[PDB]
Paper text:
[name] is a widely distributed, but relatively unstudied member of the TMEM16 family. Here we show that [name] is an ER-resident lipid scramblase with non-specific ion channel activity and a dependence on calcium ions and short chain lipids for optimum activity. We present structures of [name] solved by both X-ray crystallography and cryo-electron microscopy, revealing a classic scramblase fold, with extensive conformational changes propagated from the cytoplasmic to the ER face of the membrane, which lead to opening or closing of the lipid transporting groove.
To understand the structural basis of lipid scrambling in [name], we initially solved its structure by X-ray crystallography. We obtained preliminary diffraction data from vapour diffusion (VD) crystals of full-length human [name], which we improved by lipidic cubic phase (LCP) crystallisation to obtain 3.4 Å resolution data. Both structures were solved by molecular replacement (Methods section). The structures were similar (monomer all atom root mean square deviation (r.m.s.d.) = 0.75 Å), although the crystal packing differs, confirming that the conformation is not dictated by crystal contacts. All the protein samples used in cryo-EM were purified in the detergent undecyl maltoside (UDM) with cholesteryl hemisuccinate (CHS) added to improve protein stability: the same lipid detergent combination that was used for the VD crystallisation. A fourth Ca2+ ion site on the ER side of the membrane at the dimer interface was seen only in the LCP crystallisation, not in the VD or other structures, so this site is likely to be the result of the crystallisation conditions, not a characteristic of the protein or this conformation.
Numbering used by the authors:
A (entry chain A): 14 to 111, 117 to 188, 192 to 349, 354 to 471, 475 to 639
B (entry chain B): 15 to 188, 193 to 641
The structure:
């Protein structure tokens, strides 16, 4: 038998008609339609005498098949002449690494082939007339939608994971290239950004430290810190682009033209010939998708954003009712509105995410990258508003810096400690307990090594995505760039949390969730726009907070109109300089730009020779 | 052969130099030098012909022209309706091609290829220009550049096709502009201007119609001003975004959009140590980017800032001169005083012209000294330098009257002079007067040829003598600047001067015919440049639409109608205005981001070609 890489779990009582049909499509050659992979059940006929196979099936492929699949996805690898080119089976000897493809790459290729399994003449899933099919429809999608296939997931490499673990937690630089090799470009990019952002916050943590310790509340002192803050915000987000470009080029994912990739299983449409790639795949009119975006999805997001402000106002009206009652058991009643609002926020965030996931799926995006960018953008604007609208209200409407400091202190200390317990420490404790339980059950049987590994990973938690992880750092960047003049220790507590966040998130990836399917990402996606918008908002925030300070208002006792005009002029000058600085700093280093240019030139010379 | 390009040499150039120049223009590319055809204007001279002896005609073979078309990378439509770069080996696959036919490449394309080959004529072992030891040479140095710098070669220019120009003329002046016909004769750059001119005139029409009842019925209300300014800010973004889409359609059809101009050979003005290019692998001059960057930010940038400060200093003298003139009219009491009021405006306008001609010489010098590799880079940097100076001299006085003096009566009168009197005088100076003078020279040349009485046909002789002494078209800058300043008065001060767009459309209705006469019967044929966009002008026009948000919000916030609502709380009023301004600037950027710069069908056509290039690279590395 083969090396098992991907597991497919089928429902409770799936018909044999369906099982054999699914087996045929996963085994049959691509010429006859269907992936040319290998299919086998978790347990053999001999071991099925005791341990019955609970409709769990293992998927693998040939060494030649894997290399042909690597060409299909367009994996870029380094050649002997140190140039990065897309892999081809005919040109396999020219590649430097040629153990060539990692397990993560192998499992991604298998996932890609299973996702591109499309219905030919089948009018339904055999045995299930309710689960109707049409030419071009993704089989894996229809199987998951109907509920015939419960889940498809890649298997962990216990020995490889343990080797990475020892080089990961502990003191030195994070092994981003090792994380890439096991989890993929997307997960390694997150741990690469986390390590970078922690180092990026260090200057702001060191500069902000004497502002708290010696209580520096002067005009000159605040202007110096805010000026440094605005320069820091631009320079770190610009230097990240350059650093990411170096890393993704080395990986080869930067040279990948992801726009020509095959559509996601969730993409529906009339089967036809693609105008660009020439592939027989589903076709959906862009205007239908655009109308759903701007006429249904956009007004819904705006309604939820308005409702968020409406709910926030109820909390600030509830804090008035609670303060009046305390002024007239009362000390307990003061905590009550903060407890209620925080609970309502959690109810709102879980409900909006279901509505956002539905609408982005309904929008019908062709590529997974597009679906992700649109889904992140929807959930992010809602999560940002619910988190910062109350903070902005205290700072600029209430103008209560004592309450704002206490609000930020809860968010940066108590909330981050509780977050780490809920995020990885508690789920790890619970997963470790399940791990012993399963291990003991297998010992009592009297070779179920792979059986135990599949049963364990099957019931393990599914990693939802890098969104929740990046959002933590986005909100961190929010408190630091916006209110560092109010709370100078903002960056100090951000670095302290991030010092344990690397260890906690690693533990969450290794011993909590089952292996997530690798995605060849070339950047942090729509997060770059999000972080850059936050650095633009920080100009407005820092200029307002300085203009609001009683030190500046002492200079302008009557002429308050003049003061605002000066502040607005300074704000406009800073916003212009911020854009010039971002334009002046190239998003890619010189050597990467030249390497990308020579490859661009080669493609044009190749097209002239081929025609 | 058929003469296409003319090379004029200085009055007494040595035969050593003439034969050497002839050799480099005729010798095969393998031995170094363009594989073109060289011949003198006349083989038979007379007394009146002996003067015009150093005139030489340049042409090329049909095969040579096609090989030269491949070298520049001209993109033409294939039989499968796809746009691909020309190759002599793949010549049969291109639509409209026939070996016996010479109608494939236009005269404008042909003359561009010849110019390109003459510009890429580089010195091999020559340590100087033969016969002129002062005009030193080194390996890699452009011969055409050194010949023009030393003064051995006076000028190099393409010849007009009289019959073709007359056919275009009848379809041009008088319906929609024949942009594809202008492209065929003058090139992508000149046709792009007339394409933008025609578009901008149509784009201004809504603003001219909306602004018309604001003047006629004198609509000076809060609601009325907000509606117009809101429409103005939406209009500014949408027209500049729709232009990008329209330009993309046109440049794709032309093929210039599919051209990768970044890999093109350097301009003749580019100097450096001869070496191998890291990207193209071509043996061309090499210059370190850091040296160019230091010259830009440490010498050129502070100079531009000094001239910009001096412009504000000179402007202040004018606003101090208008005070001296207002006092001399008012303290005295006669008629002679009414004449003295016009005097400072006349002096300042003259000083501005002296400043603009002097700064342009300094800007042309510094951009050449910066040492840019591509002609596109030299143009974008030169446009940007001259534009910030021309914009400041034109608008600093307008901004001073509007926000320092806060005199809307004076601002209206200032814009009225700029949009009516100044635009009428501009058209006379731009084409009407130079055409009158060129027509007079035309009669003088025709009479000179009639007096010859030679045993040869002096049709080509007359054509060369005429076009040689004709004015040289400096570039599309002055032409685009007119429309940029127009867009400036319209997008910024439409709330103050509602007829701004009305007079802009009226001038542009004659500008099309005035600039057509200018390009046909005033200047000699300009060398075609395959442009794929309006260049740095897109950034300039977009910055103007960003400034218009600040301007319209300030002018509305300043109006006594809004200040009537806020009698004491002036701080609150500014906070509302600034909040509205920030919201509009955000929405303006979102709207520009939402509108795709290229249409769906062009994006797909560009995508399939991008995919084909990757599939080609995979097949070539396999080969
Ligand atoms: Ca955490
Ligand atoms: Ca996390
Ligand atoms: Ca940048
Ligand atoms: Ca004019
Ligand atoms: Ca003009
Ligand atoms: Ca756009």
């Amino acid at each position: 038998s083969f090396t098992p890489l991907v597991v497919i779990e089928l429902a409770q009582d799936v018909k044999e008609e369906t099982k054999e049909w699914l087996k045929n499509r996963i085994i049959a050659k691509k010429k006859d339609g269907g992936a040319q992979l290998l299919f086998r059940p978790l347990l053999n006929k001999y071991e099925q005498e005791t341990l019955e196979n609970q409709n769990l099936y293992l998927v693998g492929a040939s060494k030649i098949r894997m290399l042909l699949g690597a060409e299909a996805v367009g994996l870029v690898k380094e050649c002997n002449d140190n140039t990065m080119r897309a892999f081809t089976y005919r040109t396999r000897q020219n590649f430097k690494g040629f153990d060539f493809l990692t397990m993560a790459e192998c499992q991604f290729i298998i996932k890609h082939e299973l996702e591109n399994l499309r219905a030919k003449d089948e009018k339904m899933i055999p045995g299930y007339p309710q689960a109707k099919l049409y030419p071009g429809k993704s089989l894996l999608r229809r199987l998951l939608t109907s509920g015939i296939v419960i889940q498809v997931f890649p298997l962990h490499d216990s020995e490889a994971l343990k080797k990475l673990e020892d080089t990961w937690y502990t003191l030195k630089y994070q092994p981003i290239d090792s994380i890439r090799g096991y989890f993929g470009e997307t997960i390694a990019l997150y741990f690469g950004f986390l390590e970078y952002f922690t180092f990026a916050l260090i200057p702001m943590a060191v500069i902000g430290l004497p502002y708290y310790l010696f209580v520096w509340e002067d005009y000159d002192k605040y202007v110096i810190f805010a000026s440094f803050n605005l320069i820091w915000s631009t320079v770190i987000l610009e230097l990240w682009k350059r650093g990411c470009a170096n890393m993704t080029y080395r990986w080869g994912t930067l040279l990948m033209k992801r726009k020509f990739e095959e559509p996601r299983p969730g993409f529906h449409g009339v089967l036809g010939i693609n105008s660009i790639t020439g592939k027989e795949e589903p076709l959906y009119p862009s205007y239908k998708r655009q109308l759903r975006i701007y006429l249904v999805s956009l007004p819904f997001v705006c309604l939820c954003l308005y409702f968020s402000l409406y709910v926030m106002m109820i909390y600030f009206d509830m804090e008035v009712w609670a303060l009046g009652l305390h002024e007239n058991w009362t000390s307990v009643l003061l905590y009550v509105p903060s407890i209620i609002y925080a609970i309502v926020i959690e109810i709102m965030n879980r409900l909006y995410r279901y509505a956002a996931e539905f609408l982005t799926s309904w929008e019908n995006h062709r590529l997974e990258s597009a679906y992700q960018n649109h889904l992140i953008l929807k959930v992010l604007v809602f999560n940002f508003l619910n988190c910062f609208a109350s903070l902005f209200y205290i700072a600029f409407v209430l103008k209560d810096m004592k309450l704002l400091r206490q609000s930020l202190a809860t968010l940066l200390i108590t909330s981050q400690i509780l977050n780490q317990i809920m995020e990885s420490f508690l789920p790890y404790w619970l997963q470790r307990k399940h791990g012993v339980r399963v291990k003991r059950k297998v010992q009592a049987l009297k070779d179920a090594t792979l059986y135990e590994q599949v049963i364990l990973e099957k019931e393990m938690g599914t990693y939802l995505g890098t969104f929740d992880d990046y959002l933590e750092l986005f909100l961190q960047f929010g408190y630091v760039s916006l209110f560092s003049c109010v709370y100078p220790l903002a960056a100090a507590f951000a670095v302290l949390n991030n010092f344990t966040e690397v260890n906690s998130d690693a533990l969450k990836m290794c011993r909590v969730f089952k292996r997530p399917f690798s995605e060849p990402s070339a950047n942090i996606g729509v997060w770059q726009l999000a972080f850059e918008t936050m650095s633009v908002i920080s100009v407005v925030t820092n200029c307002a907070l300085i203009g609001m300070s009683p030190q500046v208002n002492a200079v302008f006792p009557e002429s308050k109109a003049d003061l605002i005009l000066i502040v607005v002029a300074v704000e406009h000058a800073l916003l212009a300089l911020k854009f010039i600085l971002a334009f002046a700093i190239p998003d890619k280093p010189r050597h990467i730009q030249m390497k990308l240019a020579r490859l661009e030139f080669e493609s044009l010379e190749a097209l002239k020779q081929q025609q």
